[model samples]
Target chain A: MNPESRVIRKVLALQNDEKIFSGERRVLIAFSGGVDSVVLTDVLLKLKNYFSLKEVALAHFNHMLRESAERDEEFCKEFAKERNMKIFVGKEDVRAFAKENRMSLEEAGRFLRYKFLKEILESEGFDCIATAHHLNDLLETSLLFFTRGTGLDGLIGFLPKEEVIRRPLYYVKRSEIEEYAKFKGLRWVEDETNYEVSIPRNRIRHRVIPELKRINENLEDTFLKMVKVLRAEREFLEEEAQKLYKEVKKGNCLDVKKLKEKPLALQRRVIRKFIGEKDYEKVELVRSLLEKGGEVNLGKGKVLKRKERWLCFSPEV
Target chain B: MNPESRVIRKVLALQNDEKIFSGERRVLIAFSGGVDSVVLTDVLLKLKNYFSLKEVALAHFNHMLRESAERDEEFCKEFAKERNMKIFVGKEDVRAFAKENRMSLEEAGRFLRYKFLKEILESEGFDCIATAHHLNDLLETSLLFFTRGTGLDGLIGFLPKEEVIRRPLYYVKRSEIEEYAKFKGLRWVEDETNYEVSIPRNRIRHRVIPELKRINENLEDTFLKMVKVLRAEREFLEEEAQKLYKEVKKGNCLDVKKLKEKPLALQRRVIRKFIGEKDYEKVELVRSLLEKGGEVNLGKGKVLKRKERWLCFS
Candidate 1:
């Protein structure tokens, strides 16, 4: 297979294997007018009938932070219209949103985009929303989480087929997207801020990831392999935690003696699931209460105290 | 706290909390005259009595790679002697060993170093061997294994305390080691080739790690925290796999019916632990047996066949 066909073939195989189009009548494409979404849109459009996908359309969110934001949404509107597909556009003052919501620019933009995509899904009757998130995006996200310390939940990072949010191009690299785009004569909106080091993800993508590639040019491939193993492991862990959580449950509280007998791993999760909290320190605080009998006011009118051999948690009493 | 006291305090607190000097009647420090080892040796020496340790000594293995190998050994002997510590030294022609063993200089050196360290533990009556492997080393090793496509084993890289080997400085950063060394007015051998990209570890240490630090200066700290969580998770997974493996074992063969009933995570380890194999292709070949009832020849006269409801490994 030549390079162009090879890329497209892999995308098809991945979508088929992942069942991205399975049980879905219609899906919305989160077209950011970027290389990733453009490639995803092209492939899904080409393979629409084979996957039995009934209808495909575009939903673009304009963050309005960049001077080129209007142009991006304009490009998406024209591109979708030119291709004879329905397109939906939503605009937001992301800078103002970030200020009002106390979020970083990245977080605010992501929130608005997801909110817009989800709104389309709920109102217009789309089965799931597809985005342009690809291999590099996955890698950068994992690196970001790893840099800031992450638990299994954060460690799992992005998923290929998260509920109501599907990434058909998850396995495809940006290079492949570009190659496919050039072969098909595709144009995309290039966000210049992506290259600016002021953003954490940008700095990782532009600097750290590139340097790591120098050390091992095939690092992405290795990490991609790790992704499958980790996801499976995380799935198993979540199941295990759920199972153990129920076993140790004593009405509204957990049995400390039984929880303590479990491994530290299980102990961490049992505390998180029971308390409905995932803070590392907070989880450890509850787990440690197993050792020495103490009363810790968990705030929110909740108190966790060791009474005799029983560990109790109740908003009252 | 003053700068000097702060560094000493952290070391003291770490040793105290970590119990680095506990239980082991005799411990050997693998000194290379590098700053990390130099600092580790100094701290252990300063806190020897407080740790209530019986005996502490230094062990230096000369790879005979550099022109200054003999000088490095000389420096180590002098340092240990000045501290009134017993030191054991070993020298090997690493270039010749690598050629003879048909191995890379890096692999051969590591093999010989560990061999010599284990020998000290076994024959010389040492309980544990301490190395200067730290956070960067762990990250680089993890990255290396990642490049080579490893499982959770690769992700968890080096443990602070693994088997007979111990790394007290596993949680310490390279910068902190340097700072501690300077604060103590300690001098050690400077390996010029460490900065060279000829070695893979050097390339990762110099190029990759610095870039990651630029992305987040506290990347090491985050990774250190991850180490604890990952190690715990790995331990849990291992226990879970063992329990599941026991259920599926039918004498020497695994019952595919029972095996397929388990999760993919458990199935992978079941095949690995039961079959005593770590090869991905080999493991996956057996794992794929669940999809169809078929026979696969796993070489070495070993064959995996799906016999009806039972997956048979022989």
Candidate 2:
């Protein structure tokens, strides 16, 4: 099959399979006037009757990252008006905010976008916030997680359905979205920031993953399959981790003797759970500290140390 | 750290961590005269005291696929002889066997090598079989599994210690092994078969993994970390799978209504376990079947059908 139809079918299949909306729940699409989001918005509008979806509105986050931000915002507003759908736009200086907060631009934008989207969902009582997170975006996010040392949660980075957000186009590939746009005679505003090589993710998309795909034509398919398997595996591990965590709890101090008794594999799981519960981000550092018997002072006066018998966590003076 | 010393430390650490020999039980090395196995042999001989190892023997499988098989065998024998260790050399027409048995060369060679190694280990009464499975081998195997639609088991393919086979150099990189060989002034015979790009694994190692490394310098380390995390995750999934298998019954028939009562995620897990238990290798096929709802004819008088109300495996 050609790429465009494949994406449409993939999106339709996920929507049909997941049963994203039961009965005419108002849906809000995070429209950006880009090819991917436009294709998704158009598809959802067309297929609204099949799924019994109603009151589809457009939500745009004007992150003000580029010089063409005003034009992009205008495009989104005009597109929504043409479709006769309500549009909600949130404006924020994401680049400057990210710089001031010492966060990556992607992270800062996501943080602000999701925060705004959630508030809108609550106020509007929308069942789900739809995003144009396509297969390529999912693959890129997965790669970024690996590069940045992400855990199991990161491995399953973007799902079709999260708690608040739903991605109908997740299974659809980027090539398919572009093809769909061409077939529909739709035009989208191109974001120049996407092509900037200064970003690690764009570099990966433009250079690294393409090389990998050249070697293995079905790299994305393979990665998706791997994610499926690992996700299933993670479900089991999370349970085991929870069980181990419950058993060896001692006022934030893990019973190292008991922890060690449960196979070395489970020991690591318990450690991961403990660190995760404590909101520790440096998992590798925690693992290293556990192995080498060193003191790790996770900020906010929390200190983790390997005592003689147990791995202990306590409030520091 | 220098490669030779690192190799020595790794071997010693493995021996120290897990007792290599107890009650006069000996250890046997799957000596291939390759950098990994040869380095392993050299390290074991040099640091024999670290574990108080009772005995060390070498076993070489001559899979007559290469023209230089004889020379490779000769090198293994000479290396064993030089270290005053007994060498067991066996020849198998792997190419012919694979052709007759309808197996790939890699599949046949691996099957025969392990089969022969097991027999030798049994006869010698060795505690464990040590091979040269390093980080690169682990990464290649993981990638292969990923491509072939493998589950968590594929992600963590290498175990530092499995019942009778142990990989002491699991953490060491291939570069470290080569560095150790060079540092020790060791000369080893190269297996020309490894250079052949006909094999999928060879291609991945030569072409794919290097690109991955270029993208992320710690690609191997990243995968190793993934293995550790996924291993823990797999343990939990196995438990859940086992529970679901018991609830749903282990067979070709599954109760779709009962399975659907659980979350879709759990349903997928049940499908994976059922397929795995039935020895069905098509993970993707089975997954799609389960998700989309269809009749799947699993071999050996078994069938899975997803009817209107219930998914049944019989």
Candidate 3:
């Protein structure tokens, strides 16, 4: 198959096998006028009839951190017009958001971009927000999580489909997307900040990935295979955790004696489920109570206590 | 506590809690005269009477990759002599071995080093071989395995205790080792090639770790915690695989129908255990045989086949 055909075949396989876009007849592509999104938009439009997609449109968010932000918005609109598809454009002062939230520019931009995408999805009633995150993006994300000490769950970075975010280009590589984009004679605006080393994501993209690519030139393909196996393993563990959680949970209390004998992985999962806490340290605190039989004061007037080999929570007045 | 005290206390806690060195009184230290090994030797001797170790000696392998290799060996001997400990030394031309085996210099050196260490342990009748693999080494190994697509097993790089290899410095960071070495006023030879970036491990140590440490300054502590959790998960999965393997194997055959329902992790493990295969792709090929009844050549006078929905070796 040609490059375009090969990329489409992957998306088609994902749709058929995983049913990633089964109920989603309408999709709002998170278009940024980058090569990845350009390829993503073109591929989905090509497969629009095959999937019997009812509606497909572009959603573009201008972070307003770049001097050529207007140029990007104009380019995206022109591209959408050329394709005869509707486009939604939004802009926010990402620098101000970053300053107010005390977040890095990358973090602030991501938060606002996703917030914009979700708003469009809700207001326009699109089925889901389609992203252009591909295999290389997934690897970068996994590396970020790995370096940041995000355990096993972090390593299992992205899926083909999320609750309201679908990634049809999940299996496609950045190189392949570039190939397809050039093959189709597609045009995209270059975000100059992508070359700036101050950004963590860019640093990973330019510096770390090249170094890793030397270790294995086919890192993307190898990582794609490993991720599938990891996902299956994760799904099995999640199933086991749910079953154990049901057994260990006694209404509002947990059977600490039984959980103490379980595996650490399961103990952490069960405790997180019981206490409904996302913080790793807090969940660890609750799990520790299973051994020492003490109490941890969770915020908002909630306290988890272990008594008589059972864990229960109380609301402090 | 001081740096030396802290380092010794960590090893002591490992012995008391994990019993890593309980019965293994006669240990042949894989000494290279590097800071890590120097600290390891010193710490073990400090705890020698506490653990009541009968014998502790140094084993040095000169890879002969550099001109200073002999100097490293001599320094190890001098260190051992100063402490009144026996030292065994060996040498091999690692470049020649690398050429003959079509392996990298690092791989060949590793093979020869382990070979020499094992030979000393067997010939001298030592209980075990203790290495100076610290937390940074474990992280570097994990990164190598991860980049090379080694899957989950590679990430659980090292443990405090293995079957015949014990790492008393498993939890100790490289900085901590260096601090202990300096605080104790110990002298050791440095491997100049460590600064050479051509070696993959060195590249990771120099380039990658610094970048990662930027993400989390306490990368060693965080990764130490993660590895322990991962090891527990791996152990649990292994226990599950063993139990499942027992049930799925009937006499000399495997019930393919039953094994098909197991988790992918368990299936991969059980297949490896049953087929006695360590190659990831080969084990995957055997597991793939379950879904489609077929046979695969095992490269010897043997083959694995599926008949009547049962897998058997022929």
Candidate 4:
């Protein structure tokens, strides 16, 4: 099959796999009127019966960050109208909100847009919220985490199932989305701001990825492989953590001598598990104290001290 | 503290931690007459009173790869004589052995060196084998694994305790060792091949480390920090793996459906744990099969298939 149709079919398959419409349920596409989301909207509308998604609706948020933001919203509304689907147009001066709240424009826009989506989600009774997140986006996020020194939480960023949101096109690539849009003879309002290199995500998309690709020609493939490994490793760790929790629950304070009796690896695991359950903020502090021989006060009325005899975890409050 | 004193203290501390003198026994030092090993030997001799050591002797292996190999052996003998220590010199033509076996020079050297070390370990009634593996060596191995793609095992390449062999100076830096050596005014023969860039490890030491430092001024420190985190993560996985092993059992096929139900991270861990129990050849094959689904045969007339339903670890 062609890449374009393959991508469409893949998205449709994900929607089906998710059992999106268990009975008769409506779906809402988080439409930005971009090529990717527009193409996804077109595909869902075309294969409306195959996946058993009865009704479709378009949700657009005008953050008012770009000059052509209203135009994009109008295009989305008209596009929904042309398809005989309902449209919800939400507008918020996100830039002004960001300036007033001392938040970045991107963060403010995402906050306002999600807030709007949630309100619509409650009122419209949509089964899932679909976005244009693709493989490239996943790769970009992974790179960002590596650069930013994020832990396992950030490593597991942008999963397919996160609350009510469901990204059907998670497996598809951006190039495939563009091809699908072209193949369907669909037009999308291109946001000029997206092309600007000043944006952090765009900078990664443009610079970092290309530089990484130079090291290994098949970096995308490498990343996908790593993702699978990391995911598997995380699952195994969580399972082990659960078992360790049983041993940990027997006492209020962790016995440093007993913990030290195990391998350094298990020691850290038990420590992370205990901290994650009792007080997460002190994980780093506790870990540092254990490694370098120091004392830390866990904010939640608890204290951890590393003595010569043993590293002690105690509750102060 | 003097260089000799510091070296003695480090070795003594490590030996004490390992409970060397706890039992009625003696320990052996795998001396190479290099600054690191020489320093260790000097320190061990000084700290002999603390532990009820039956004897202290030097074990040196002549790889016979270089033309100056004989000179190195002579130097070690003379050094041992000067210190009034018993020196056991074992010679093997590592280059010829490597050629005959169709192995790389590096592989041949390691193979013969360890083989000789083990022979002495058994015959001399030595309880432990101490080597001069430092932080720099560990860092290099870690970087190699990181670039070549490795899991937990590769991440912690140079463990402190692996069977009978122990690295007393694992935490000490090479620069610190050199500083100690210079401060003591200790004379030592230098292996000219250490400067040869043709070798992979030498190239990494001379080239890659500098490049890494350029990328981040604190690259060494950053790498160390990353290793600590990765080490912790790996430890957690290992503990999880042991628990999973109990449920799965050895030589039994892993249930693919159940494995899939787990987060992908756990699945890989369980698979790696199972593979490690088998031979190296089977482990490599199994690892490949896990990453890119395939069928393989295991020991004891067992067949395994990584089907869509399950990774049958038969």
Candidate 5:
């Protein structure tokens, strides 16, 4: 099979399997004119009719971090226009925003980009926002989480089909996407910063992952297999936790006796949910309340107290 | 506090926290005359009265992998004798065993060592076997699993306490153990091979971990925190799967309807339990049978088939 056919088929299979484009007539592709997004654009265009997509548009967010940002934005607009697709362009001073928000440039860029994408998604008739994150990104993100010592959720990493965001290239590798793009004669603007190891994500991609690939040649396949199982397990546990929370929760309070009998994971999860916080330390502190009748000052002038058998969260005196 | 007192308190706290030494009056420490085992020996002896231990003995297995193996064995014996502790010594030709079993020297050595330890535990009436595995080993094993691609269980890695094996030094670091040994004026024979990067575990310890430590200075503490949660989650899921399996299983057959209604993880688990297999591909194949009437060859002439609403394994 030709690379175009093979790539399209692979992506279509993923889309169908994960229901990535299900119940969606319009898609707002988060375009960057990079090879990944360009390839995603081509594949989605080929598979558009199959999914009955009435309209597919492009949404490009330029971080304005580089002097070439304007050129990339123009390239994205031209690319979408040539493909007979509508386009939305948004730009942000990422450096200024990072300083103001006290976040790294990457964090600020992603936050602004997502905020822009979601606004376009809602304001426009697009049902879902499609990003060009590929398997390489997923692996890098997973490694980043692993190195940072992540919880189970972080270890599972991102999914192909998030609520409002769909990743058509989730299972596709960067090499495969590059092959498909070249085969289709697609044009993409290169970001020189992508090659630099200043960012941890790129560092993992360029350094850590390459060393790991030497250990396991099929690193992507193996990591994806592990992630699939972990994702399912995480979802199952989350569902179970939610169900238990419903049963054990009484408005703002929870039944300590009921929770204490449950598994440790479930107990911690339920406590986390009740406190409306995902901080591991806070959940542990609240869980300690179940054993003895005491109160934990849950910050923000809120206090969680264990009175008899119920865990109550109220404003601190 | 002094390093010796501090290290002992740390190990003692881990023992009490995980109930590592509970119900085990006699512990057969897998002694290698290494710093870890030597420190573990000293700490356990100091806390012997608190645990009410009747006896604590040493079991050293010389894999005969090195010219210094005999010297290390002698050192372990003399160290135990000096401390007035009973010692059991065993030897195995690990290289020859590796050749015969088509395994690496590491695998063969570990297999022979564990077999020897278990034999000593049973023959000597020791309740449990204590190993010198510490946080560094745990972190190395976890990284190995991550690099090689592992299931959730492997990601959790080894525990401080297993059914027959106990690791009192599970939370202690190698440096801490060395400090404890030095402060106690303890003598230990070092394995020269431990520093070589030929083995993956050692390579991880010598190379990869240092680079990672540059990323997270408290990598051991962070990894342990993650593992603790994962371990509890794994145990919870295992318990839930066992419960579900009990309900859905019917003597080599499972009610597909019952199994299909549960979550994907539980479904896979119950099927894996019913099929008596942990292979991911086989579990997936058997799960496919829940929705479609089909059969899968489960190797060893064993076959799993879906007949109507029943998944029959033979």
Candidate 6:
């Protein structure tokens, strides 16, 4: 397989992945016209079956944050000028969206882009939305969450497919994407904002990772393998937790006697999952419920009362 | 309660800790004459029960590397002159031991320390060896292991009580030990070699942890909590794994007939535990065994042969 096939091979190898390319399956590439997205669109066209369907479309959303934004939008249109069958184009005021939604500029841009991309998927009848996220982003996201001492799930939380959006470039290296784009004589625009170190992600990408890389060159590879192990571990634990949760949970009431029989670790998760609430105060309330048979005050005027056999949560009387 | 009571209150609060003060237990302090051990011994002296008998004796082993080794020994003797009770002392050539054993200086020194400490415990009929290991050391050791990406055991491996060694200062803070030492006007030696960053632990203590602290000031504290969570998780998983391991294992050959019915995650651990080999290659061999009947070479002439319903290991 060529450099392009390796990228597509990743998508084709995914379990239940054929439906992504087979039968009326439409894929809309969220084109930022960067080297990453440009290579992604190229790979979608170069595949074999859906590869031949020639059913790829370009969707572009200009955030209008930078002064030369319209010029980049024109570059995207010129890039995909001939293929205008349900071709996607939009302009969103990301600054206004950020102010309105209280999100950072980076968060708002992606939100608007995804919101716009999902709308295109619905109206244009596309089954999947492919973004340019790759291996580098995985390392960055994991590091970002690792600082807060996140649990196993947050360590490797992102997946190749999040509902309708499919990250075909998940395993592909960004350097490989750049090489493929250059090899195919593809021209793309660079978002100057990404180079700004003011953003936390760029600071980590530019500084922290490089310093740590000196200690271990393949630290990112270590993180990926760690993620795989924990993912397997997480799946096993979730299955067991669900099985136990069903065994002891009695509708809105939980058997305190039964819950105490389980290990403290499983009990913590089960109480959180059963009460459908997560936070220190409520979890502590559940903790108190375990210790004695009495009414413990959960936050937000909710009271969890424990009797001889069961524990139930209700609005404070 | 006063300052002295607070010190013993830690042990008094411990469940089943009464047996330590109440029985044939004779505790010996592994004294280094540092702020940590000084405070530990002081606490042992400050406690009313142990204080009345003054039963604790100082055990010292000079590493014989430092130039001031004799001075440190002299100071320990003077320090324990009043509190001596069949106190034992010795010195060993750790550098020579390192060369002989082909071990690192750090390993050789600790090996000698523990070797000498245990002998003191046995010859003197002491029931337990108390070390001045505290919260900060716990945090540092875990971080050192965390760099290598250790699993459950390494995350929370250092126990407060490991066999004959009991860490009375496990919950005590290093800074608290220093403060208590100063408040009581206790004297202790400062090892000048600690300033050298050549040692990896020193490098982490002086450099890496401080740099990480700038990012999050309470990183060491965060590690302690992470250990608690992972420790609990480890217990749960081990219990589940043990339960399932019993169900699947039949002599040396795993019941592949029954093993295939389990999830991949459980299957991986179950095979690793049963055979007592945890490498990926062997785990993958079992995975292949379940899929189809085959023979896999397990390196050094150990072949895992799949014969019908049984995956036998030789």
Q: What does candidate 2 score on TM?
A: 0.81
Query: Candidate 1: DockQ?
Result: 0.62
Who wins the TM-score comparison?
5
CA-lDDT, candidates in order: 0.81, 0.74, 0.84, 0.68, 0.85, 0.72
Which residue pairs of candidate 5 clash? none
> Model 6, residue B97: what's the lDDT?
94
lDDT for each residue of candidate 2 in A237-267, tens digit (9 for 90 to 100): 5666688888887876877666655754566
Better of 1 and 6 by DockQ: 1
Clashing pairs in 6: none
Query: What shift in Å separates residue A264 of candidate 4 from its native position after superposition?
Result: 8.1
Query: What does candidate 5's lDDT look like per residue over B45-90, in tens digits?
Result: 9889898898889998888888998888888889988999999999
> All candidates' TM-scores?
0.93, 0.81, 0.93, 0.62, 0.95, 0.82
Task: Single out the weakest 10-residue window by summed lDDT for candidate 4 chain B.
Answer: B212-221
Assign candidate 5 its CAPRI class: medium
**TM-score rank order:** 5, 3, 1, 6, 2, 4
lDDT rank, highest first? 5, 3, 1, 2, 6, 4
Docking class of 4: incorrect
lDDT of 1 by residue, A191-227 (tens): 6776788777888788777867876677766777778
Highest DockQ: give the candidate number: 5
DockQ of 3: 0.57
Off by over 4 Å in 2: A1-5, A62-78, A88-92, A115-127, A189-198, A211-216, A239-300, A305-313, B15-24, B64-70, B115-128, B191-199, B239-296, B304-314
For candidate 3 chain A, the 10 contiguous residues with the lowest summed lDDT are: A191-200
Q: TM-score (0 to 1) of chain B, per candidate? A: 0.93, 0.83, 0.91, 0.82, 0.95, 0.85
Candidate 3 Cα outliers beyond 4 Å, as residue runs:
A95-104, A277-284, A297-303, B98-103, B251-253, B277-308, B311-314
Error of 5 at B249 (Å): 1.4
Clashing pairs in model 4, backbone N/Cα/C closer than 3 A: A231-B264, A231-B265, A232-B264, A232-B265, A232-B266, A233-B265, A234-B265, A236-B266, B256-B310
TM-score of predicted chain A against the true chain A, for each candidate: 0.94, 0.87, 0.92, 0.82, 0.94, 0.85
